[PDB]
Design an enzyme around this catalytic site. Structure first.
Site, PDB file in Angstrom:
ATOM      1  N   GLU A  28       0.762  -1.225   0.000  1.00 45.10           N
ATOM      2  CA  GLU A  28       0.000   0.000   0.000  1.00 45.10           C
ATOM      3  C   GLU A  28       0.800   1.286   0.000  1.00 45.10           C
ATOM      4  O   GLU A  28       0.245   2.324  -0.350  1.00 45.10           O
ATOM      5  CB  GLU A  28      -0.971  -0.015   1.152  1.00 45.10           C
ATOM      6  CG  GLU A  28      -1.969  -1.165   1.112  1.00 45.10           C
ATOM      7  CD  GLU A  28      -3.162  -0.959   0.212  1.00 45.10           C
ATOM      8  OE1 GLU A  28      -3.343   0.053  -0.431  1.00 45.10           O
ATOM      9  OE2 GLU A  28      -3.985  -2.010   0.203  1.00 45.10           O
ATOM     10  N   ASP A  68      -6.185   7.796  -4.935  1.00 46.72           N
ATOM     11  CA  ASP A  68      -5.607   6.494  -5.170  1.00 46.72           C
ATOM     12  C   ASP A  68      -5.869   6.059  -6.606  1.00 46.72           C
ATOM     13  O   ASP A  68      -6.496   6.752  -7.391  1.00 46.72           O
ATOM     14  CB  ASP A  68      -6.092   5.415  -4.153  1.00 46.72           C
ATOM     15  CG  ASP A  68      -7.516   4.994  -4.381  1.00 46.72           C
ATOM     16  OD1 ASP A  68      -8.236   5.569  -5.159  1.00 46.72           O
ATOM     17  OD2 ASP A  68      -7.851   3.855  -3.797  1.00 46.72           O
ATOM     18  N   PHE A  84      -8.237  -6.672   3.545  1.00 52.02           N
ATOM     19  CA  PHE A  84      -7.924  -5.265   3.786  1.00 52.02           C
ATOM     20  C   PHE A  84      -8.220  -4.414   2.537  1.00 52.02           C
ATOM     21  O   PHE A  84      -8.789  -3.320   2.543  1.00 52.02           O
ATOM     22  CB  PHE A  84      -6.431  -5.236   4.102  1.00 52.02           C
ATOM     23  CG  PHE A  84      -5.884  -3.886   4.428  1.00 52.02           C
ATOM     24  CD1 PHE A  84      -5.483  -3.055   3.385  1.00 52.02           C
ATOM     25  CD2 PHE A  84      -5.764  -3.444   5.747  1.00 52.02           C
ATOM     26  CE1 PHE A  84      -4.938  -1.803   3.685  1.00 52.02           C
ATOM     27  CE2 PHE A  84      -5.209  -2.198   6.065  1.00 52.02           C
ATOM     28  CZ  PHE A  84      -4.803  -1.369   5.010  1.00 52.02           C
TER      29      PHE A  84
END
Ligand SMILES: [Cl-]
Ligand SMILES: [Cl-]
Ligand SMILES: [Zn+2]
EC number: 3.2.1.17
Length: 163
Positions: free
Chosen positions: A11, A20, A104
């Site tokens: 990440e 993002d 996640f």
């Protein structure tokens, strides 16, 4: 290596609000703020999450705090889910980490929808799972990241992450 290190590599770390790869507002270690196009909405969310007027910037420590919370939630997401838990519980330590990574990233619900792969993983049919997992929007949109996770499921080692 462990989940944290793993996710930190996948990440990255950004201390200022950013858009993002999906065009959403995120911060820190993959901490999604809002799927909304308004920066204001994202700052509001940030201040709420951190508990202070951030102006869109946070510290390393603060980012690490959001991250610990997020990793915790992914796990708890897994444990609560009828389709995810039994799989998770069948896996070895390395592979558990790869399941957490996906949760996640995409959410408990999202991963729970990969019925076929889940079933293969539970049966320990690695090579099969890996092929099945690649036939996804997830893979096509994030080929490098998806390849690291799939490899990890395939081998049960941290090789993809060594660097
Ligand atoms: Cl929070
Ligand atoms: Cl990628
Ligand atoms: Zn994405």
């Amino acid at each position: 290596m462990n989940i944290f290190e793993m996710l930190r590599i996948d990440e990255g770390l950004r201390l200022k609000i950013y858009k993002d790869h999906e065009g959403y507002y995120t911060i820190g270690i993959g901490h999604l703020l809002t799927k909304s196009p308004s920066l204001n909405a994202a700052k509001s969310e940030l201040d709420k999450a951190i508990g202070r007027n951030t102006n869109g910037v946070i510290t390393k420590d603060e980012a690490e705090k959001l991250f610990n919370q997020d990793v915790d939630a992914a796990v708890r997401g897994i444990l609560r889910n009828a389709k995810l838990k039994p799989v998770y519980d069948s896996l070895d330590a390395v592979r558990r980490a790869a399941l957490i990574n996906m949760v996640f990233q995409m959410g408990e619900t999202g991963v729970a929808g990969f019925t076929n792969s889940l079933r293969m993983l539970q049966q320990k049919r690695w090579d099969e799972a890996a092929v099945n997992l690649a036939k996804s929007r997830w893979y096509n949109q994030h080929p490098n990241r998806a390849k690291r996770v799939i490899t990890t499921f395939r081998t049960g080692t941290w090789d993809a992450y060594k660097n």
